C-alpha cells in the first residue's frame, strides 16, 4: 500500500525504457545505476530486482529481445495470469511497450 505501488505511473511507463542496460553498446546517457534515478529514485541500484519481480518479464524482452507491436501484445496476457502478477493498473501501461512509439511517432 506504502510501498507497493513504485513512485506512481510515471516509472512503470517508462520502466522497460530505464531498465535499458544492455542495447548493444551502451549509450553514454542511460545506465544500469541511472535507470533508476531516471523515474524510480525510491529503489536502490540493488533491492530492483524484487520489484521487477513482476517487471522482469518485459525487460529481457525489449532489451535482451527486443520485440515489435502485436508481438508483445500477447505476452503481457503472461503479466497477467502468472503467479500473482501485476494488476490491470500496472498492464495498463505496459501494454503500451510499443503503441507509445508507434502512434504520434512518424504520423502517417
Do not use: C
Amino acid at each position: 500500500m506504502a510501498a507497493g505501488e513504485l513512485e506512481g505511473g510515471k516509472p512503470l511507463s517508462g520502466l522497460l525504457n530505464a531498465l535499458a542496460q544492455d542495447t548493444f553498446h551502451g549509450y553514454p546517457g542511460i545506465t544500469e545505476e541511472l535507470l533508476r534515478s531516471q523515474l524510480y529514485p525510491e529503489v536502490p541500484p540493488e533491492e530492483f530486482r524484487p520489484f521487477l519481480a513482476k517487471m522482469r518479464g518485459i525487460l529481457k524482452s525489449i532489451a535482451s529481445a527486443d520485440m515489435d507491436f502485436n508481438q508483445l501484445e500477447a505476452f503481457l496476457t503472461a503479466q497477467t495470469k502468472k503467479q500473482g502478477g501485476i494488476t490491470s493498473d500496472q498492464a495498463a501501461v505496459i501494454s503500451k511497450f510499443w503503441k507509445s512509439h508507434k502512434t504520434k511517432i512518424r504520423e502517417s
